């Protein structure tokens, strides 16, 4: 997502959670701290939508 752009993805800020040790319970803990990043973007992306065609 941030090493390559998609479709304007570049203009919003987020942090990519990371784990400690390679077991499962640190692949779970991404998927909580990765649901608490999204609500940042949906909250950041309701303010910017410019009028225009589709």
């Amino acid at each position: 997502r941030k090493t390559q752009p998609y479709d304007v993805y570049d203009q919003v800020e987020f942090d990519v959670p990371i784990g400690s040790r390679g077991d499962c319970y640190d692949r779970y803990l991404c998927r909580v701290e990765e649901m608490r990043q999204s609500i940042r973007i949906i909250s950041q992306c309701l303010n910017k939508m410019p009028p225009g065609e589709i």
Binding site: I39, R40, S43, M49, P51
Partner: protein, 67 residues
């Protein structure tokens, strides 16, 4: 010319994490706890020390008669 975004103003509501509340922590327990267990035994040592006082009374009638 009817489109979505309002004029100005919003939240946000945060994403943050807190839900830590206690709750008698840190040796406050082990303090009340061992305090109840004792008042348990002190409530014994008396009932059980009274019930024996009746026990002898019961074996008394038996020996009273039975000649």
């Amino acid at each position: 010319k009817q489109d979505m975004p309002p004029v100005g103003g919003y939240g946000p509501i945060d994403y943050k994490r807190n839900l830590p509340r206690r709750g008698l922590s840190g040796y406050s327990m082990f303090a009340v706890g061992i305090g109840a267990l004792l008042f348990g035994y002190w409530s014994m040592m008396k009932w059980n020390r009274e019930r024996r006082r009746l026990q002898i009374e019961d074996f008394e009638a038996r020996i009273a008669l039975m000649p």
